[PDB]
Amino acid sequence: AAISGTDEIRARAEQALTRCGVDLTAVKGDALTARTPLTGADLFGLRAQTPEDVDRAVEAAHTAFLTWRTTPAPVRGALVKRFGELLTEHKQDLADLVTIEAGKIRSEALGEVQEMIDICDFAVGLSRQLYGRTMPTERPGHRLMETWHPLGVVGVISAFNFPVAVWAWNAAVALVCGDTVVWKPSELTPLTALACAALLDLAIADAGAPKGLNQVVVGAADVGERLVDSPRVPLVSATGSGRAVGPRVAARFGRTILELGGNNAAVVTPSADLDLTVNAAVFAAAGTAGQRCTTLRRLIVHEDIADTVVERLTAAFERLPIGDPFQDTTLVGPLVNEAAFGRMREAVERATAEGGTLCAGGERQFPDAAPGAYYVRPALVRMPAQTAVVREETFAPILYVLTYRDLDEAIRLNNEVPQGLSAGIFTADQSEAERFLAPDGADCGIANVNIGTSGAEIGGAFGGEKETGGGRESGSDAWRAYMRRATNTVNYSGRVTLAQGVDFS
Amino acid sequence: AISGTDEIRARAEQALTRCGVDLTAVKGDALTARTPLTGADLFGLRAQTPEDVDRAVEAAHTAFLTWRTTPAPVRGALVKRFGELLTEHKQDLADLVTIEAGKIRSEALGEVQEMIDICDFAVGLSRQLYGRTMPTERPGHRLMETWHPLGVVGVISAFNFPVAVWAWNAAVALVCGDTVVWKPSELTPLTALACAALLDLAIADAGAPKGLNQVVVGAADVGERLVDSPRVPLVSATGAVGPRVAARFGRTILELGGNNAAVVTPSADLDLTVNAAVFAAAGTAGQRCTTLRRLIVHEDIADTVVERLTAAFERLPIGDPFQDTTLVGPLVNEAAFGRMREAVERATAEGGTLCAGGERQFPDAAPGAYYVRPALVRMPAQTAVVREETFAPILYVLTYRDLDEAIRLNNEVPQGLSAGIFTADQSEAERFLAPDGADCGIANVNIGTSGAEIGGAFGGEKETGGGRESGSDAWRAYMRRATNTVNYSGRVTLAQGVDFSQ
Amino acid sequence: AISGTDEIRARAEQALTRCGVDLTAVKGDALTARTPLTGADLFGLRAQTPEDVDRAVEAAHTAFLTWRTTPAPVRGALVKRFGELLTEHKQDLADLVTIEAGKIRSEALGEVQEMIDICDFAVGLSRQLYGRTMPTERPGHRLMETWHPLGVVGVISAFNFPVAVWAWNAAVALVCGDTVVWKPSELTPLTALACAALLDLAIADAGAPKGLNQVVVGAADVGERLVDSPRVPLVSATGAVGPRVAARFGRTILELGGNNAAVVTPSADLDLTVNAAVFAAAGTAGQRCTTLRRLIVHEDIADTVVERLTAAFERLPIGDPFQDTTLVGPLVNEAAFGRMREAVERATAEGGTLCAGGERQFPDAAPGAYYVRPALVRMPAQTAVVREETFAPILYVLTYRDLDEAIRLNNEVPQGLSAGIFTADQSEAERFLAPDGADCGIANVNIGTSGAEIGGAFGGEKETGGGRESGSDAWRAYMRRATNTVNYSGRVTLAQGVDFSQ
Amino acid sequence: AAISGTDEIRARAEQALTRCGVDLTAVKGDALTARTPLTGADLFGLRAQTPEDVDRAVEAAHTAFLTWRTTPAPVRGALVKRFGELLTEHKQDLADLVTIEAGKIRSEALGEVQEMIDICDFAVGLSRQLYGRTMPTERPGHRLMETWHPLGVVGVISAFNFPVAVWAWNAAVALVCGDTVVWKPSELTPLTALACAALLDLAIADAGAPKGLNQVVVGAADVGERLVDSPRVPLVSATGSGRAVGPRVAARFGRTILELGGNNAAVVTPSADLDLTVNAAVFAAAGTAGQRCTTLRRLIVHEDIADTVVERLTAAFERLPIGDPFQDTTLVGPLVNEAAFGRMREAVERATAEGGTLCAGGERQFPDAAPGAYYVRPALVRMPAQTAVVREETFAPILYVLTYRDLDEAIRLNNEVPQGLSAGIFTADQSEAERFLAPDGADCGIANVNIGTSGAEIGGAFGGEKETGGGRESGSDAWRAYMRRATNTVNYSGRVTLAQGVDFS
């Protein structure tokens, strides 16, 4: 197979970075390295921040916050509007960096950048809303209201698999809420973050906004830990497959938004439109090479249609074009690294050991074409029961197929796992669709009808329940997590209730 | 005179039996009920074990499986019936509040009335619990956000509001489809037994499931088992919990105390301010989370404000909380008195001047009880003792000149519950409430740090814990959000223009 | 047998005195109370003049000046007390509803319970009535939106819901700081007198102002003076008003009737559909604004659906509404019967087939009363008589093949209150509720055209009038919005970068 | 004085129109005429629509609506975003047309165009919101929700004095709500409307949106009446100083948004910052030559400071630079036409007849410099009582000064007039500011503290009470007036309540 060479990838990365305003000589170094899953090779070395630099960055962000929090929110929205314009102008440059570092095909990388633009649009509108309330008070000659105020520095921890959209959800909303941002991107995807920050620094300069509104800290795990532990960071937002962030921030009386992984199922009922269901399940299971927190990993199929659903999924998986994510023909690019491939192969072998049958895929493709990179065909595994390996999230394209008879059994099977991010049901039956969404239905934070588990849009709150961590980001009123509520009682009567009737004047 | 222990004991037993408590089933020898009025033990109680906690959680979870599909308006009908029974027994319950918490009759009655008011509010919520419907970018699709019952709610309350805090949590949680396991303060079990018996009668009257609410009486080990239960998705603690519950991916509502200040500007109405400050600092013997502990006074009026406050503190009527003439009842126990004396001793060692109060009153009248005059201490700066709250009536007076420095002094402490500003100046009032003003969860103008009501969200920031209870949309913490997209178009349309065709 | 007029009269007088009405003060010779059960007059009543209306408005406006500064939670306390008195007298009031409106006991009881439920909902609203706070583009400024009491509310109700419609309006209006002048149907004055006497007792118990609510009994000239008053900023009319009130810059809430349809798809559960359709078409003798009048059935099941409906209509129990076996009580008067017969005669002249019903029942048993079997008419198209509602139990059956044409048939009429679809198909259900589906204010799935409840906004589109009552945020129509910007910066800053310096 | 010549104005107008994409040969004609208050002269003739053309336009807008209402709202928002970009690009061209037709100074014309851009920003955010509700139902195995649906064709009637912003408030919101628009602009300001429509038609072409989303009908009163009476127009929005629109639309069971004029007051208390109060009152009274519905026309001053407030306002009015609104030095341009000047002079003469004293202004400036145009100095009139002429709105810069003693008297004086649009209070006293805003305070739809009566921002709902007409447009949830509410009960239980327990199956 034809896979881009590491040198050609490095040239495309340097072009994209320079077009987005990154000063290559300023960010290059020998402390860390940028890399690409397309070949598995290092691209070039980078400077690093120390933990001491993290503290300096947090304090500079707090200084900016002291000015930004009294900057009128519609003015803060005008900065985010300028940034959305730069993102639109550089959409393909940023998408190229997403493909290079996350291994996403062109269409998915462009779609991820489009999420950034969409949430910028949403946040500009929010900058004239951020609604609190006015309400009656029981006290004569008083007034009562609830207001929302900027919180402080927001620490953003993102993962390799959505290296730009997750930060954009957090930064666009946080900035219009009067917060500032310190971003710790994945050690696997620093270049996407450098390009994003450079475009925002240009927006900031054009707007005359404070220079410290957003900063990227490049480093390994000690860098992230220092961010998480800062007493100057009242909110930490951590997305990706992290589990220690919650307790450690709680211990210093901080706030967290946590979205920590998913093990997402779809139910296929006897009345399901099978052409629709197969197409939707293929994208949900195989998109991003199965490396979304929202990836479809469990398919719960009614026994009357199980055999035909497996036959059609087997053929679909066998026809998936795997290859270089820069080629328009490709639908499946590589896994992120060798450790991900190892975990996938161990899960598939555990599954057959636990009684399962591998129906399609699972094999490494053209290993000699790019020996450092791991391209795999998505695996389809039929399972007699929801055993230990099925209940574990493996960050790889593995779709386990379980059968059911009663709808309540399908719901129990969906709910049995420790995670709780997203769920779907495919059905033409009005009653089954409502029962799946009812309070005793699927227990996840996202629950869909005739749609798979992935590909949310910006207008809804995004996040999940149980061990997914409970946070919400992006749409609806998820913005409230980035501000503090105040309840204000205002007395204009000139008097106060006298305790026991006694006047001490 | 001070009420006798024998008379207090008989009133407590009468209140309990009238509220439906079976004294034979609850009496024992593992724990004792007590009263701050004399310091004496009332009688012994049965206690629960950690294994009893696990059994109570399983019964609450079984009831939750039925309650969560009971229509919310039907769940509200139960809470309306509970409010009626509370109204019926308002005086009986208030007597137990005075007996166990030591608060004066009028405040005990007000606390029971808070329970009734939150029942009425929750009945209205039972037809709302609003989510949203909104557009989607995909043709032939629909998008909405729905709210669902969460599960078993663990409630941990303190001695100082022994019935209203649980009522905030239980009324809202029950209409939200949740069930409740309640661990009251070991200092105030009798109030909780009475509350639970009245709710159990309402449950019987409604045909509702028996496990909707349960009280577990016990020591620290009982509370820890509740906090650690994997079947308790929400823990509400008022008065270690935070990271423990976060470690098992649970949710918390935390309101952990306050160190509340009011700013007095040069244009303040001094009669209003003095009355407001006395009642917020001395009320409940300084044992409210919202108690006024810091007064930040402009230097040009500081001397006259301290003289007026000194005169008022010297006149405060201290005595038996069953006497209507009493304004200040006793502190809860000897440790509370000891911590108060230690704070005042530290304050004077840190440069402060004791202007009034601090002395113990009529100790021979009840040697086991601690009636103390609230203390007023003028301080040269916001020193260590000022920044850390003592749960006692001590009012520290600090001075300022520029309003931004008064705001900084308000915000400098680790707590963040409530704040107030006394001023006739329109701009000063607004600056105090502005994003760069007071940083607390509650910030008021010309009313004190206890100015709050059922319809407002109640809670604070920083080390107060971040939770919100009672009013506005605090109910959302008792439910789980779901984002639902529905495709009725018969085709796969992917968001953001993604294309997965070959 | 049918209840005797003498027994009905005595029950009415007993109900009225028990609800606090002074029979001596209200009896007269200008108007008469009546009963559809026998058609007979009960006794004579005093009537008000247009000058009495003007005096009632001035008294309501004087009370409004006090009520609008009474804190909303205190206003809610009055409505809670009213709900308690309604609960106390539920059976007495329900008896008057059956006597005057002719509706069966169970429905009369349900209507009084609606009043109690909206009282409970309004008590919750009294702590909400939410406006907004939001950012402003100007530094050192604050922006909010507040809601204020409007003034005197005129309420015009119909015979068919003689107590619940006024309760929707009065409970919400009172907690919103408004006062009420009520003009009930000339056919049902006794229910209104009872309601007002119970509310006046609650007003006395609360120490509230006496003019918060008043009833004016009279003919058309009394209603017109209310509609035309320049001191009545809101007129709510259920069952000329619109442009008249608009001409004096007043506000209206209009719910003027319905011509409601349900669509029956090939996958409909036929037992569910038949039960749902019978109760929505025949209930209240077809005299609900939400009554089912049009059934749009897929051609492949149309024959079997008409046979099942024919069998059910022939079995409907018609009789005295005080007998629990009765499902269909009498029509309100002779004119209602005449209009029904004329519609059925027109339908058959326009090509339709009378499948069942339409005949008058036991006329000799009560020659002044009109008990009729609901009529079922199969129609070849949606002709003139189908498009204009007759306030009578007539169910027209139309057929379709494509769902978009069933939707067009639903939407084609001038009315727009409610609609329903019976289907097992997920996509058909969603299409019916979609922006290009049914155009009505209420659109339901697998429940009939009367499917509504307190927590939902109630009302319709097109010639139904556009108003909304009861639930969600319908309360906003009873208040006035204010947008408030507050400058605390000490400088003039103009929006949009305007510069007026020289 | 130096006033631009009619020929120079015509050249600037033709340049602005052509830059905004208007085809001059297509819109010119001999039925009506464009004009300018700067000289009072006609500029050039225009084609007209007939009433029959109005009906054709309404039906074409309804056809577009049938497609637009199922176009996803975020897609509808993308059109409004493109239109906001064209408005930003042509801001000064449009501002020139606003100056030419309404007579506004450069700063106010640019600010009016900026309102259009701001509401486009707001509406793009709204396109992912348009929030209804989900809520509990009392019925087991049912679900309940409230949804919002597009309404239909919206008829927009605007006035001369805000010839672009009012339509923008209505069109940006209506379009994202899935409605379509037929716009009838003032007969005095057709060119601004032609330019706005041409820019939006370009946005529509770029987006591939339906061609009939917005149309301008140019004509006299018979054209507007036909729009108002159309049974295909479920909402009519009429802004400007109209009073017959309400009843006529009500008679055909349509909906209206009405904002029909104002007679707006500000209260000046003894503690008022007088430098602030005078500066604010001068802009509120004199801006737009007193031709806003929000113009300050009544000043209610405490008797202890009345004399000094009048002295300072007298000097400020005497120093106002009146002249050509294209010159940067000008703060006051001309009144719209001779009829407006006549009404102003008649009001001032009535006022002195009713006991008042003319303290400053009121005289026509340099009549021979532009004999067809009416430039006047704003008039300041001290009045012994709130007499008939004070309670009447005269659409001219006349500021009546009334004195008071008790704050409740000032509030009664504010509330005594038939209008109810906006009110302000200038005070340093916390109690007086709250009392003015309380339920027994000012009765207007807008009530401000230390701000005048004009110059609202886009984020608030705009409109008034009493004879102002009750409508709200622009911000908050004013968008709900452009959609229809539906209450949906969904039964998934398979059963229904059986009446009297009887099962007919």
Ligand SMILES: N[C@@H](CCCC(=O)O)C(=O)O
């Ligand atoms: N919009 C994407 C985001 C996934 C986020 C993640 O996998 O961490 C989706 O809903 O699939």
Ligand SMILES: N[C@@H](CCCC(=O)O)C(=O)O
């Ligand atoms: N933004 C302007 C709009 C006025 C509208 C009008 O006068 O018709 C203002 O608030 O003064």
